[PDB]
């Protein structure tokens, strides 16, 4: 009957929020493009409290972590190429002839380099791939670099490695990462088995298109994830149970000559052909791909009803868009992934699929324009050993569904992995009625009001407290300190100098909640209660501040006389 407001600090409550997370690298230097120095060392053992009774709603397609990863990887890519040589004096008209052998793919190009010595003009010979070389005239021998006229071409430093390294994202103080531990999760929906993690699992930022290379696999069955499943033109991420294997080789052996540009800067180019001119023939085991296509078309028939499903190749066009593109060995491959999607299923030649591939050195990454990167050639054969881990399918009318290898920007290459994780902002302050007057972190979040009110200590303890990454981290830490001082000042103005639980003695009106203490301190989670009194939060807070502290302060001011 005689109920009073009591303020509880450290409540296991949260709401959806978007922030910047700290990148952490495995403890395990190589100057790898995604800099190790930027990212903190990983904790030796992660903690994964298995939140019980918590059924949170996840949605891969509205997830700020994916966009944050896109921005972070773009920033790290640009910063890694910042101090490397810029190929400004190489737009010169190139006299090119076909290499005497593929046919016409490699061009023997002569050009006059005018070095910074400025008393010589050196005629030099170099080999360029056909994809990077475009005509400039009706003369069949005069060409230029493909994108050097509308962009500044940055040469990648040969000392930068492109080998994938697992990168974790760890929550800052004041936020939490909730992981969905289900096995057949469909990306968008409620999750029945939720845990809280400080950092995510190892994520290899593999860059590829039409197909996801390396990474985690499904545990129960092949999982097909799409936001709507009927609008079309929405990537149908496919995660597999068993991994096919993309063995890929570039047979040709090449020698890398260097040409001075300025004092301490060099353009690394292709010297001459050693051995015969072969082609890059990626080998995929046909039987295994058969099985994978079966285990995918079954699920697609389940989702799209028993229609005939046809896997077609992508629509024709320029090689960069249409063809699959590895990041293996430091050489950018573009493979004609047509034999893999050439089947009608409804309801015999060879045993290995050989995909031809073309190597390209001048590239435009992240779908940007006006910027371009030159990858210097690698001496010797390149022998990949990748693992088929996922597919990206897109849809296009006689009762047949046409699926094609499609995809999108690199965000869709990480929705396939960060589909079991969500970032949540925690608001530790809450209020509840009591009779008085003046496990791990969120482990009791799904528990009732009673017996969750005994664990605020851990949540209160663990909730709070150079360069571009530096400034972002400084802004994040300052914001966290701000939040913490917001909470502490709210507690101070409420007369709770240092009391996780502080009784107010403000009367508990019956227009907020009419439920009795038994039905308020049991039968409900802190989430349902915080939602319930959401509208009255401002009013209640006002009453805790105005009605008491002021009056209590005046009273104590009047007690010493």
């Amino acid at each position: 009957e005689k109920l009073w407001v009591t303020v509880y600090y450290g409540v296991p409550v949260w709401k959806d929020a978007e922030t910047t997370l700290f990148c952490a690298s495995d403890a395990k230097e190589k100057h790898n493009v995604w800099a190790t120095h930027a990212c903190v060392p990983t904790d030796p053992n992660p903690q994964e409290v298995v939140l019980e009774n918590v059924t949170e709603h996840f949605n891969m397609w509205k997830n700020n972590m994916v966009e944050q990863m896109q921005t972070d990887i773009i920033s790290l890519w640009d910063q890694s190429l910042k101090p490397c040589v810029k190929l400004t004096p190489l737009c010169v008209t190139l006299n090119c002839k076909d290499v005497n052998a593929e046919r016409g793919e490699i061009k023997n190009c002569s050009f006059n380099i005018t070095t910074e010595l400025r008393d010589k003009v050196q005629k030099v010979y170099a080999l360029f791939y056909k994809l990077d070389v475009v005509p400039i005239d009706n003369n069949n021998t005069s060409y230029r670099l493909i994108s050097c006229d509308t962009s500044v071409i940055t040469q990648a430093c040969p000392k930068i490695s492109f080998e994938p390294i697992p990168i974790h994202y760890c929550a800052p103080a004041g936020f939490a990462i909730l992981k969905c531990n289900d096995k057949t999760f469909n990306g968008k929906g409620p999750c029945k088995n939720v845990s809280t993690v400080q950092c995510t699992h190892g994520i290899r930022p593999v860059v590829s298109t039409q197909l996801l290379l390396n990474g985690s696999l499904a545990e129960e069955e092949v999982v097909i994830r799409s936001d709507n499943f009927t609008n079309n033109a929405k990537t149908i991420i496919v995660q597999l149970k068993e991994s096919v294997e993309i063995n890929c080789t570039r047979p040709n052996n090449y020698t890398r000559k260097s040409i001075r540009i300025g004092p301490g800067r060099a353009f690394y180019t292709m010297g001459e052909i050693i051995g015969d001119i072969r082609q890059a023939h990626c080998n995929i085991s046909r039987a295994k791909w058969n099985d994978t296509l079966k285990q995918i078309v079954i699920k697609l028939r389940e989702q799209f009803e028993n229609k005939t499903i046809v896997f077609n190749h992508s629509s024709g066009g320029d090689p960069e868009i249409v063809m699959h593109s590895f990041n293996c060995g430091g050489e950018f491959f573009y493979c004609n992934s047509t034999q893999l999607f050439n089947s009608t299923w409804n309801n015999t030649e060879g045993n290995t699929i050989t995909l031809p591939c073309r190597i390209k050195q001048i590239i435009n990454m992240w779908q940007r324009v006006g910027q371009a990167m030159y990858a210097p050639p690698i001496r010797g054969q390149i022998r990949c050993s990748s693992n088929i881990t996922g597919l990206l399918l897109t849809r296009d009318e006689n009762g047949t569904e046409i699926f094609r290898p499609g995809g999108g920007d690199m965000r869709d290459n990480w929705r396939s992995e960060l589909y079991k994780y969500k970032v949540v902002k925690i608001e530790p302050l809450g209020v509840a009625p009591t009779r008085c007057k003046r496990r791990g972190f969120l482990g009791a979040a799904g528990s009732t009001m009673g017996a969750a009110s005994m664990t605020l200590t851990v949540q209160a303890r663990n909730l709070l407290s150079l360069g571009v990454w530096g400034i972002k981290q400084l802004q994040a830490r300052v914001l966290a300190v701000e939040r913490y001082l917001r909470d502490q000042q709210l507690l101070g103005i409420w007369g709770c100098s240092g009391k996780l639980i502080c009784t107010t003695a403000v009367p508990w009106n019956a227009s907020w909640s009419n439920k009795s203490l038994d039905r308020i301190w049991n039968n409900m989670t802190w989430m349902e209660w915080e939602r319930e009194i959401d509208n009255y939060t401002s009013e209640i807070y006002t009453l805790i501040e105005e009605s008491q502290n002021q009056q209590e302060k005046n009273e104590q001011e009047l007690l010493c006389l």
Partner: antibody
Amino acid sequence: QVQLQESGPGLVKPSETLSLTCTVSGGSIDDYFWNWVRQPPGKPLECIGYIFGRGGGTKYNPSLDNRVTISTDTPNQFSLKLRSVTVADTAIYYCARWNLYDDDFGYNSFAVWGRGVLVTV
Amino acid sequence: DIQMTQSPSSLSASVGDTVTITCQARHAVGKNLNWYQQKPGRGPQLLIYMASSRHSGVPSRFRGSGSGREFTLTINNLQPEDFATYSCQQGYTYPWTFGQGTKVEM
């Protein structure tokens, strides 16, 4: 205040050469791609080709089987030549200015369009 | 080439309502999208460039945003002068394909 005006015949029979001339008023030709585009009835706008500056590099929509040639005739007039015109080529033809520079409005967009001339077959 | 589609193919609206037009690319184009306005008897006018930047002199009411293959143009407080055919264009690969076009009716 750069304005573009197309001119040329409004009727060309099949298989001869279709000739159009875009004249630039207000300002002289400058280092922006000058582009010919068309809109057939009931179809989206289709890029035909472009030329850079006063004589220079060109590029043409690959899916035309090299039937198109573009060149500059006068410091404020450039022209489109389209060979082997067929009945499918009836369209409203526009000349447009495509910007190359990100320090001005309309980066990578047809900032300036002409009125457009309807050519049938 | 890269096929572009947009939705709805046509819609009706009155003065003062908000209109949303979705442009979908068959392949990712980054932020390199432009929005054009076409009226009878007049050449196309540029409304938005690089998918979120309004061109000089364009009314503030026109708002456009998106990334990857997905973009949306929102016209708030529809004016009688804004009834026109709106189209989206890419900018990444040449030819920069346009789109079917949405006609805004009274």
